[model samples]
Target: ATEFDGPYVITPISGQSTAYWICDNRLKTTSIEKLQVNRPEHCGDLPETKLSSEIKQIMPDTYLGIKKVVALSDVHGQYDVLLTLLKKQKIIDSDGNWAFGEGHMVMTGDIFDRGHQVNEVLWFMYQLDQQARDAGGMVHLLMGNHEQMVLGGDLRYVHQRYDIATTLINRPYNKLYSADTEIGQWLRSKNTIIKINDVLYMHGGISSEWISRELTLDKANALYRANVDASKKSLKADDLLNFLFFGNGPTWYRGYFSETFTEAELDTILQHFNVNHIVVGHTSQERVLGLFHNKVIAVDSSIKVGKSGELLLLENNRLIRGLYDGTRETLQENSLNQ
Candidate 1:
């Protein structure tokens, strides 16, 4: 395997600054400082990082009074295309660094699986997270189903190289991001659903069943954090876990795409959260499109193949389709097919 992985700055309870790296399926461990300066030639362009020695705080589920927001989803390990879209849209510079000054960005989820560049993608986001806070913006990497799957040891969709990585490191792929690891700890802090200035964002669409469960954005994300690493059997055995992790859960539910509902049903989920539009990513669309008079936006664009992708730009109340080629098309939809 010629793939390079990590520079996975794994921090333990002892607060040791150890970084785990895999080059050509060979594993190595070194201090963060050591690896930063002496990056191996095999690790082509490790996502430059200012890896922290501390575990970060859990992010809030709701953000109000936001001015600008950009949303995209289902990267599925396509790091190169992701960088291309971000750079072309001027979100990041040529150095793969943050440049979106004070504007918030939402990666609606699925940053894992299906491709070989996941390590690079995670590192880029890790660096971007700190860079965003420093520049007064935020990058939300919500918990998609793939994220939950990988972290919980369901490695079915992972790239083959990662399978090689597991055996090479003599550890499971999921263990690579286990609690003691910095990336794992950071990922555990992510929210499943976050509201940004009246728009709801999550990896998958919230189902009508929300009313039955009487769930709030806050409660849903709270439960997700608690059971993010729980076993599949554990989820099925618990009522609350089943409601939040199964078919109708935020990470897998795509009710908006299928089993179409009426305005009243949509309004119920909306008014319950007190948000106007709900944006989701599990169901892939040819491009970013709005449904129900722009009430719901599906923004996946399928970056799994690494050929093309798109993003959603919400600035000053404008809904625009941000394309992979760097062009934007203002979205104007007024149709419903229920």
Candidate 2:
């Protein structure tokens, strides 16, 4: 293998079931069969764009005092839908720059997979993350299960184009997001859960078991990051890494969807997290919903899979749904079931 300071191309070999990467002024070829069996390693020498230190400062739980907040979830790579939602909320202008002055934007996760424009969505969030901070606003891109899957080399739901590109480059799909890449590095730095003001934001609902551990928000994030890094080595079935990647974990739990928790259990969770409400996105609903007496809000409207979607807006201590056609309504128990 050779190294260079720039862009490289992967070309398919003529009349052969193989492809190769032309890097560092050298052409290296590998059979498709061999490429499938060999896992890609971290290319430490490759240059990567560094995320701001502020990203690291975000604890697993955070408290903010913002007045107006816009929250969405489960975008699933629908760039146009995301853009339209932001525009409708006046969060971004026609140029796609931040316009929700001093307001907070929270994305609950599942921003990757199930769509072809994953790269666009990731880059757009990255850009807005900075822009929002500069304008006294904030963008919180919490970790979702799909993001964990891609980083951990679990590509079952990855787009077909990504699979073909990985094969053409003779690299594992995860390597495309290896630590060497800017977005990959940035993603690894995100928190799994964060609390804004009194509302808690997470990709999936937190289970009673997780709260039982009594782990601090910072400790939970640290463990998650360490487990993801360790997955690049070798993972065991009975490991905590597996627990974090599977059911009841931060990104896969569905206590709210399953309705398995009693009202008291939900209240216990809220008390542990020290928040009044928990907002999540992994479970798809027809519209933004408030359940368990409005203590838990489900925001995963299944945008890419549905004809239209809604956004959850928190203003004046009320939870409202902003429709695609630019209408808003206070979310209530009747509205959720409707």
Candidate 3:
């Protein structure tokens, strides 16, 4: 079993504007990493805006006595499919607004770079932030790799949108790539790992190093906050990079890539964290593979694979599978929520 190191502290500046940067890779101890700025010939210039109104309202305090949470992962840029999934789960109302009752939602990241309507998807979740809280539920959104590339000034996604496959082409979607942009700022503020009722939720898998370091809830939260804040200022901190790209730990580990981890490894991870189950969404699960064991439940139905997105519902230490079509089933029951 491994230990969890507590949260790392960061000094949030009260004054002066700072430019934060996040990359998918880790920083070398000996060198300083530079933040990439996107400047295109056709587009004139873009200004950095304050965090979006939706982002400003992310407060976990309002969630008193909250027990149920819905975990969703890797929507990519499929807004239509996302809407369908949310509606089916009753997270949103008939008019495309927030409506999950008092239950909360946790997204597994990768909101950029795959499909169209990336900005639309971000804004949609941002707007629902308050509604989720008001309903007595909390929303936990983590960061993924694509966030690193964009924050690091990789414009290849922009080019891909323009059919400029041969060259690093910039597409019309590239218009959304703004330095110090509101979305970037908002993402920089997100917690890489959110622990709810003892279950650890992260974008990528966690590494053995992270698992071995024992950390308190406050400590874990602190570590995430420090790196996120540092990334904004373009400071290449190990914590930020580790949070973004570090693999080997449970947070970003590819144990599920091909069932690399043995049942014993899974047992050790659960024992280390002192948690009953693990919930994640970075890796796509085309059809919701419920790996039943004493601990750990993987829920990453590939939303990109048709409209079959999946979610996990936590109630009383048990997991219930929820599908994009408003179907719910218990993994223990060996039933599909069709």
Candidate 4:
């Protein structure tokens, strides 16, 4: 079983950034194997695997002419729940491969922390990203607070199983994802906000303060990526970094769920980004909820609870809630608002 633990590849700085693969059996044994990053190999649990590599050129913050999209969020390593939801929604085939053709899938971050099977979920999506691309589609995995948490050495929310991984590998959980590691490099390359057609999607809702800052979508995302793991004291000293990473920022704000958030504020964000609607996840709801007459869409759907979850489907002008039972309920159909 330890042999199956990983081909956990680290691209140490000294190796001219070549991948150094290692695996541990938790406690009973240890072994080190070697593999290339994103190269097809028979390693770990998958009969065939490519650990995944980020494209050198980061994906753009805005997209146009996207016909179909699926949005979900806050997986928190609930691999089974994510699998079931994707399978039920036909985003992936029964054989656990990408099935949605040329349709964009947006995973609004929080893929790290709080669950035992994160590696499974990570590797699954690692392959899915490429599979989706090969099928003329795309998968966007944004960074959430949990991901920043792990990358920045805040292990309070990490699952206990990962605690064991630390001891086995003789390194803290955060170090496993250091800048030198393949996964860390991949994660750091992702975006914090993206617009597709008329919809803007992110891990958390944009607050009124976003208007005050008067930042562009590209600038906001670039700043966060450059300093995602900034020291807390440094962030406190810098107002902009604090606002972008802390309670008021895109990945942490929940103002959209509160009553105080007015339609005008939402409109301000919409006009700033030039999008018709905003879809976000971070504030969980019982199911996918559309607020302010569908101007704001909340898609968290409580996937972290480990029972079930849903997906928000955008096809043409219709907004559909994809249920766990493989049923699609049109929340808004042929409406200009959607």
Best by lDDT: 1
List per-prediction Cα lDDT, in the order shown: 0.82, 0.71, 0.55, 0.79
What lDDT tens digits, residue by residue, belong to model 3 across residues 295-332? 55666678755456877877655577787678887764
TM-score of each: 0.93, 0.79, 0.69, 0.89
Candidate 1 residue pairs in clash (backbone atoms < 3 Å): none
lDDT of 3 at 85: 82
Better of 3 and 4 by TM-score: 4
Q: How badly does each model clash, as a count of residue pairs?
A: 0, 0, 41, 1
How many angstroms is residue 258 displaced in model 2 relative to the true structure, after the best TM-score fit? 1.4
Cα lDDT of candidate 3 equals: 0.55
Which pairs clash (backbone N, Cα, C closer than 3 Å) in model 4?
A: 2-25
Which regions of candidate 3 fall more than 4 Å away from where they truly are? 1-54, 57-65, 154-159, 162-179, 213-244, 249-251, 292-294, 333-338
Q: Write the per-residue lDDT of candidate 2 for residues 1-338, one digit (tens) a residue.
A: 33321112121333223323333434344343422312123322322222343543443357667898888999887777888878887779988889988888889888888876676577678778878888988788888988888888888888665644565566787776666554566777788878788888888888876765666668777777666655544545645555566787779988887756788988988888778789999989988878888888889988868356778898876788898778888875323432
Q: State the weakest 10-residue window (summed lDDT) of model 1.
A: 329-338
| TM-score of candidate 4 on Cα atoms, chains taken together | 0.89
Pitting candidate 1 against candidate 3, the one with the higher lDDT is 1
Candidate 1 lDDT (Cα, whole model)? 0.82
The digit string of per-residue lDDT tens for model 1 on 22-127 reads 7776777676663252356676666556664332678787888888888999989999889999999999987778999888999999999998799889888887
